[PDB]
C-alpha cells in the first residue's frame, strides 16, 4: 500500500463514565491526524502537518459534517434497537471507510458498518449495492439503495477521498517519510531452572519491524513469544520478543532487529 486514508467512528450507549458517546478518528498512512468527539463538539488537528496546511474553513466544514453524522448515529442507535427488540442494554455502532492507493496504482474503496461487534452492512463499490450481513440490515439496505447515495459514495471513495489523500500525503511528506532507529535493550532473568531473555525495541518508525531470537545463528521461531507491535505516544512504535533457554546459554543467543532505518539488520547480545 502506497498511501491510505481511513476514517473510523464509534457510537456507544455506554461509553461510559465521563466519556464521549460518539468518537470519530482519521488516519493518513496509519498516522492519526484528526479526531472528533461528542463532548468537545469540534473536529480538530492531531498532527502539525495537517494544522499548518489547513485553514479555519476546513475545520468548520469538517466539524459540521461530523456533527451531522453524530445525529445520524444518535437516531441510528434507536432505529437498530427497535429492529432487534432492545433494550437490550448497551449497544455499539461502528463504521470505517476510506481509500487505499496500492503500489501498482490501483485504487481500493471500502465502507462498512458494524452493530455490537458483528458485521452489519458493507458497500460493494463495483455493483453499486449494499450487502446486508444480517437480516436486520435489510431495511437499511433498501433505504440506501433507493436514492443517489450509491453514486455519491462511489464518487467519494474513487475521487474525493483519493484527491484529498494525495494532498494529505504531500503535507506530511517529511513526517511520514521519517526513519527512526529503534533503541534496543537485551535483558535476562534467572528463574527456577529456566533463563528468559528479553529483547525490546523502543521508538521506531515506520511501524513494520522484524525482531527474532537466534541460537548460534539460527532463528528460534518456535519457542519465542512476541508482544506484537504497539504504539508510543509520540507516533513511534514499540515491540518485545522473549525466549526461554537453559542456563546459561546466554552466550549462544542473539537478537536480530530488522527495520527500514537500519542499513543492515542489528545484532544484539547479552
Amino acid at each position: 500500500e502506497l498511501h491510505t486514508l481511513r476514517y473510523i467512528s464509534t457510537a456507544m450507549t455506554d461509553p461510559g463514565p465521563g466519556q464521549p458517546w460518539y468518537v470519530d478518528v482519521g488516519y493518513v498512512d496509519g498516522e492519526l491526524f484528526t479526531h472528533y468527539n461528542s463532548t468537545a463538539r469540534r473536529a480538530v488537528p492531531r498532527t502539525e502537518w495537517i494544522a499548518a496546511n489547513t485553514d479555519q474553513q476546513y475545520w468548520d466544514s469538517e466539524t459540521q459534517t461530523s456533527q451531522r453524522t453524530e445525529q445520524i448515529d444518535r437516531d441510528g442507535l434507536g432505529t437498530l434497537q427497535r429492529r432487534y427488540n432492545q433494550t437490550g442494554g448497551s449497544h455499539t455502532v461502528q463504521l470505517m471507510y476510506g481509500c487505499d492507493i496500492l503500489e501498482d496504482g490501483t485504487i481500493r474503496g471500502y465502507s462498512q458498518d458494524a452493530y455490537d461487534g458483528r458485521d452489519f452492512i458493507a458497500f460493494d463499490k463495483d455493483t453499486m449495492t449494499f450487502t446486508a450481513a444480517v437480516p436486520e440490515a435489510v431495511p437499511t439496505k433498501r433505504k440506501w439503495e433507493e436514492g443517489d447515495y450509491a453514486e455519491g459514495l462511489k464518487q467519494y471513495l474513487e475521487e474525493t477521498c483519493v484527491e484529498w489523500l494525495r494532498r494529505y500525503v504531500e503535507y506530511g511528506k517529511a513526517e511520514l517519510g521519517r526513519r527512526e532507529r529503534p533503541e534496543v535493550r537485551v535483558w535476562g532473568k534467572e528463574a527456577d531452572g529456566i533463563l528468559t531473555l528479553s529483547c525490546r525495541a523502543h521508538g521506531f518508525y515506520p511501524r513494520p519491524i522484524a525482531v527474532s531470537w537466534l541460537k548460534d545463528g539460527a532463528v528460534q521461531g518456535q519457542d519465542a513469544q512476541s508482544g506484537g507491535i504497539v504504539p508510543n505516544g509520540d507516533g513511534t512504535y514499540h515491540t518485545w520478543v522473549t525466549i526461554d533457554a537453559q542456563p546459561g546459554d546466554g552466550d549462544k543467543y542473539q537478537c536480530r532487529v530488522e527495520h527500514a532505518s537500519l542499513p543492515q539488520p542489528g545484532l544484539y547480545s547479552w
Binding site: 466544514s61 461530523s66 453524522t69 433505504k143 467519494y156
Partner: peptide, 8 residues
C-alpha cells in the same frame, strides 16, 4: 475530508 452520511 470526512464524507457526508445518511440515516440507517
Amino acid at each position: 475530508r470526512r464524507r457526508e452520511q445518511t440515516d440507517y
